Design a protein around this ligand. Sequence first.
Ligand SMILES: CC(=O)N[C@@H](Cc1ccc(OP(=O)(O)O)cc1)C(=O)N[C@@H](CCC(=O)O)C(=O)N[C@H](CCC1CCCCC1)C(N)=O
Length: 102
Amino acid sequence: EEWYFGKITRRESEALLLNPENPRGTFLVRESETTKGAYCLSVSDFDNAKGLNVKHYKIRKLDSGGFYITSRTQFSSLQQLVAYYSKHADGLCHRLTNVCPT
Ligand SMILES: CC(=O)N[C@@H](Cc1ccc(OP(=O)(O)O)cc1)C(=O)N[C@@H](CCC(=O)O)C(=O)N[C@H](CCC1CCCCC1)C(N)=O
């Protein structure tokens, strides 16, 4: 239940997002399974080559500071990241739209 999904798997994230009900920009935030201390923004997309597909963006945190996907654009928290990208794609595949249901 969203937007923070905590310790779900990459593949489980993907199975959730890829519900055909879900529009482009459907998203969740999870822990990164593989980088410890990182988080992950997982977003549903579409192209006519791949069809329905998902992109994953690592969210790093500086020790000393803020959260980021790109290091020139930082946030003092995860809700501020999410609020930003809800208004602007700014290099993401798509603007954040629905939170992932379930
Ligand atoms: C295999 C994979 O998904 N890697 C992920 C990263 C990841 C790793 C571990 C995670 O943790 P976990 O193991 O739990 O999933 C979660 C996510 C990945 O590279 N995404 C791509 C972007 C999505 C895509 O275009 O696909 C990525 O960073 N692009 C970078 C940077 C691109 C830019 C684009 C402009 C805005 C700032 C980012 C690159 N190439 O310069």
